[PDB]
Amino acid sequence: TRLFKVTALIPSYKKVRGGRELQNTYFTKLVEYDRWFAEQQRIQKQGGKILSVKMVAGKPGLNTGV
């Protein structure tokens, strides 16, 4: 259990901004396991929708080596 692969959609609800921000709304990124709880919380704070999460680097259910 090392790296998560998370794809999400984060619309904007507080402003209308004229730069390029398509990369900020919908993005797929790799988050560390220790980072992922806080990352998921932060995404849910902003009103984002989490589409899929997958284990990438580590192995699920490792009692050691994590």
Partner: protein, 160 residues
């Protein structure tokens, strides 16, 4: 283990292992026979060490077994001795590994909140591990007893 720690520390800067890390790995693999004999000695005498450790805890802390305590009752005493079994197994794991990472991520990470969720006093835990250290070091040879004692001291400092 030692190899894992050295490898991750070297890969942190994306570089090959320093002669210092190579030397620590060499010292670790050089002493594998003595630490594995230590693992033999500890795993062969599990029940004895666990029993004397429980007795020393109960005599040092009659508080826990008395009614209203966390360890009052036969089942809760069994859970106490079961946790002592877990922790000595983890100590053997750390001895064979040469590092406390298995102990860390099996029995140390989240142990505070865990024994909070079990109403288990942490001073009770440190008394338990001190009793385990005393019993184990009593049985082990002079050089091996110190090596076991350092891991037991790490565990004691980790719990509380």
């Amino acid at each position: 283990s030692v190899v894992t720690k050295a490898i991750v520390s070297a890969d942190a800067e994306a570089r090959y292992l320093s002669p210092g890390e190579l030397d620590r790995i060499r010292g670790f693999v050089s002493s594998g026979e003595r630490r594995l004999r230590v693992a033999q000695t500890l795993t062969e005498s599990r029940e004895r060490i666990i029993k004397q450790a429980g007795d020393q805890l109960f005599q040092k802390r009659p508080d826990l077994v008395s009614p209203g305590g966390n360890a009052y009752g036969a089942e809760r005493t069994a859970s106490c001795l079961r946790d002592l079994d877990y922790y000595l197994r983890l100590v053997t794991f750390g001895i064979v590994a040469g590092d406390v990472t298995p102990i860390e991520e099996i029995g140390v990470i989240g142990v505070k909140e865990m024994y909070r969720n079990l109403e288990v006093p942490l001073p009770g835990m440190v008394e338990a591990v001190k009793a385990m250290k005393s019993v184990a070091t009593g049985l082990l040879s002079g050089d091996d007893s110190a090596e076991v004692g350092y891991y037991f001291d790490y565990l004691a400092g980790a719990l509380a």
